[PDB]
Every structure is written in structure tokens, then in C-alpha cells.
Design an enzyme around this catalytic site. Sequence first.
Site, PDB file in Angstrom:
ATOM      1  N   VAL A  19       7.366   0.226  24.119  1.00  0.00           N
ATOM      2  CA  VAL A  19       7.077   1.360  25.004  1.00  0.00           C
ATOM      3  C   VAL A  19       7.032   0.886  26.462  1.00  0.00           C
ATOM      4  O   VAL A  19       6.325  -0.073  26.802  1.00  0.00           O
ATOM      5  CB  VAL A  19       5.767   2.082  24.596  1.00  0.00           C
ATOM      6  CG1 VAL A  19       5.402   3.193  25.602  1.00  0.00           C
ATOM      7  CG2 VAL A  19       5.916   2.660  23.208  1.00  0.00           C
ATOM      8  N   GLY A  75      16.966 -14.596  29.979  1.00  0.00           N
ATOM      9  CA  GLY A  75      17.523 -14.046  28.747  1.00  0.00           C
ATOM     10  C   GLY A  75      17.481 -12.534  28.761  1.00  0.00           C
ATOM     11  O   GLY A  75      16.833 -11.920  29.597  1.00  0.00           O
ATOM     12  N   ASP A  81       8.288  -9.993  35.461  1.00  0.00           N
ATOM     13  CA  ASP A  81       7.894  -8.590  35.213  1.00  0.00           C
ATOM     14  C   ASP A  81       6.629  -8.189  35.975  1.00  0.00           C
ATOM     15  O   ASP A  81       6.329  -7.006  36.068  1.00  0.00           O
ATOM     16  CB  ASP A  81       7.645  -8.342  33.723  1.00  0.00           C
ATOM     17  CG  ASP A  81       8.925  -8.138  32.918  1.00  0.00           C
ATOM     18  OD1 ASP A  81      10.052  -8.278  33.453  1.00  0.00           O
ATOM     19  OD2 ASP A  81       8.787  -7.827  31.716  1.00  0.00           O
ATOM     20  N   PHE A  92       7.866  -6.132  39.753  1.00  0.00           N
ATOM     21  CA  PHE A  92       8.641  -4.901  39.984  1.00  0.00           C
ATOM     22  C   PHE A  92       8.079  -4.106  41.170  1.00  0.00           C
ATOM     23  O   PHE A  92       6.868  -3.968  41.304  1.00  0.00           O
ATOM     24  CB  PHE A  92       8.665  -4.020  38.744  1.00  0.00           C
ATOM     25  CG  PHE A  92       9.705  -4.424  37.748  1.00  0.00           C
ATOM     26  CD1 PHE A  92      11.050  -4.184  37.994  1.00  0.00           C
ATOM     27  CD2 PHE A  92       9.353  -5.073  36.572  1.00  0.00           C
ATOM     28  CE1 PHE A  92      12.023  -4.566  37.070  1.00  0.00           C
ATOM     29  CE2 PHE A  92      10.346  -5.444  35.650  1.00  0.00           C
ATOM     30  CZ  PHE A  92      11.659  -5.180  35.907  1.00  0.00           C
ATOM     31  N   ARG A 122      14.535  -3.021  21.598  1.00  0.00           N
ATOM     32  CA  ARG A 122      14.177  -2.311  22.819  1.00  0.00           C
ATOM     33  C   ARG A 122      13.487  -0.974  22.456  1.00  0.00           C
ATOM     34  O   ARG A 122      12.479  -0.584  23.071  1.00  0.00           O
ATOM     35  CB  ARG A 122      15.419  -2.098  23.682  1.00  0.00           C
ATOM     36  CG  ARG A 122      15.213  -1.289  24.937  1.00  0.00           C
ATOM     37  CD  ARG A 122      14.848  -2.110  26.086  1.00  0.00           C
ATOM     38  NE  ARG A 122      14.528  -1.275  27.240  1.00  0.00           N
ATOM     39  CZ  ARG A 122      14.504  -1.694  28.502  1.00  0.00           C
ATOM     40  NH1 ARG A 122      14.792  -2.953  28.807  1.00  0.00           N
ATOM     41  NH2 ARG A 122      14.190  -0.828  29.478  1.00  0.00           N
TER      42      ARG A 122
HETATM   43  N1  LIG Z   1       8.393  -0.233  35.810  1.00  0.00           N
HETATM   44  C1  LIG Z   1       8.717  -1.323  35.107  1.00  0.00           C
HETATM   45  O1  LIG Z   1       8.115  -2.394  35.194  1.00  0.00           O
HETATM   46  C2  LIG Z   1       9.903  -1.189  34.150  1.00  0.00           C
HETATM   47  C3  LIG Z   1      10.470  -0.008  33.854  1.00  0.00           C
HETATM   48  S1  LIG Z   1      11.725  -0.325  32.770  1.00  0.00           S
HETATM   49  C4  LIG Z   1      11.455  -1.997  32.752  1.00  0.00           C
HETATM   50  C5  LIG Z   1      12.265  -2.983  31.932  1.00  0.00           C
HETATM   51  O2  LIG Z   1      11.754  -4.296  31.997  1.00  0.00           O
HETATM   52  C6  LIG Z   1      12.812  -5.104  31.475  1.00  0.00           C
HETATM   53  C7  LIG Z   1      12.607  -6.550  31.897  1.00  0.00           C
HETATM   54  O3  LIG Z   1      11.401  -7.035  31.287  1.00  0.00           O
HETATM   55  C8  LIG Z   1      14.104  -4.534  32.092  1.00  0.00           C
HETATM   56  O4  LIG Z   1      15.114  -4.511  31.052  1.00  0.00           O
HETATM   57  C9  LIG Z   1      13.644  -3.104  32.570  1.00  0.00           C
HETATM   58  O5  LIG Z   1      14.483  -2.005  32.102  1.00  0.00           O
HETATM   59  N2  LIG Z   1      10.424  -2.291  33.549  1.00  0.00           N
END
Ligand SMILES: NC(=O)c1csc([C@@H]2O[C@H](CO)[C@@H](O)[C@H]2O)n1
Length: 190
Positions: A134, A14, A40, A43, A130
Site C-alpha cells: 500500500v 534495484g 525513500d 521524496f 507491487r
Molecule cells: N509519496 C511517495 O513516497 C511515493 C508515492 S509512490 C512511491 C513509490 O516508491 C517507489 C520507490 O520505493 C517508487 O517505485 C514510487 O512509485 N513513493
Amino acid sequence: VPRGSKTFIIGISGVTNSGKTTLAKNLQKHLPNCSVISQDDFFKPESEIETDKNGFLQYDVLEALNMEKMMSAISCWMESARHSVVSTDQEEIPILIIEGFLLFNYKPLDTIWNRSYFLTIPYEECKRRRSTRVYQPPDSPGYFDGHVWPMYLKYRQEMQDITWEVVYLDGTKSEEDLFLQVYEDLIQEL
Ligand SMILES: NC(=O)c1csc([C@@H]2O[C@H](CO)[C@@H](O)[C@H]2O)n1
Ligand SMILES: [Cl-]
């Protein structure tokens, strides 16, 4: 036929800020022998993140994610799952929930999903939500319009011709509303 190898794997994807992690956690509270993996958590470090023409950091694409490491995590769960139910007479099938913004365009996992849910929220409310969160690094001004939303739209177009069925959900519903809806669907599939 020996037991212990069967699993039930749920995908929850989503748009950003749609309540995916919360939904995963609420489902896990109500399902036996259930784990959650979060995309997440995978990354790449910022030094491996590319920039585009306008200097936006490219986070909302598969190349920002160590998906090989995510697959390894899934495989680790599967190995644990095989030992999670002690042998006896003749099944209790272990459940994994994989939740993340960018799961359903990752081709190596296209056959993993036993159920798939996709949380949707329209542009304006998504943008608003959004801005309340933070991030590290913090969203630049113009990041949502310049990167987040266009990349979401690309994902949605990548999903228009997918090889399995996805249940699309209204992410503006309350947490309990979403939980009940999904639970109601899921328990008929288990
Ligand atoms: N460094 C990160 O983990 C990160 C920087 S921006 C970000 C946001 O995480 C969202 C997914 O959960 C995605 O829209 C990214 O812009 N993550
Ligand atoms: Cl055993």
C-alpha cells in the site's frame, strides 16, 4: 598518517519491491559501525510532483526526490563517522549503506560507491509484489504499466553505460540467500 577519515560506502539499488531495505537491514545487523540511509526518506511533497500527458504522478524519476537533502544526510553521516572510532595506536573503517530505487543514475554520487549491488526481478513478479504493498497516495489502476515499469526500463537503459561495476542480484531469492550472497562478496572488499 592520521586515521578517522576513511569510510566504506555501499550502494544497494534495484527495481521496486525487490527487498532492498530488508537486505540493507540484514547487512547492517552483521557489520560493525554500520549505518543505513534510505532514498525513500527523500521524496518531495506531492505538490512538487509533476504529472505526465496521461495525468500520472511522476514519482519514479530523480526530479521527485530531494537529492540535495539526501547528500546533506550523507555528509552528516560522514561527519559522525569521523568521531565514531576513538583515537589510539596503529584501522576500523565506518560503513554506510545507501539503499534506494534510483541511486546509480545520480551523477554527483558516481564516485561514492565502494561496492554496488542491484536487485532485479522480472515484470510479472514485480507487478504482483507491487500490488501487495500500500502506497500514499495508493497506486492508481494502470500505474505500474503506465509509469513504474517504463521508468524502471529508462533507469536500466541509463545504467547500460555506467562508469563503475555493479553486481546484479536475483531478487526472487530468499532474504537469507540474498544476505549470504552479498555478505560473501562484501567481506572480501572490506
Ligand atoms: N509519496 C511517495 O513516497 C511515493 C508515492 S509512490 C512511491 C513509490 O516508491 C517507489 C520507490 O520505493 C517508487 O517505485 C514510487 O512509485 N513513493
Ligand atoms: Cl579521539
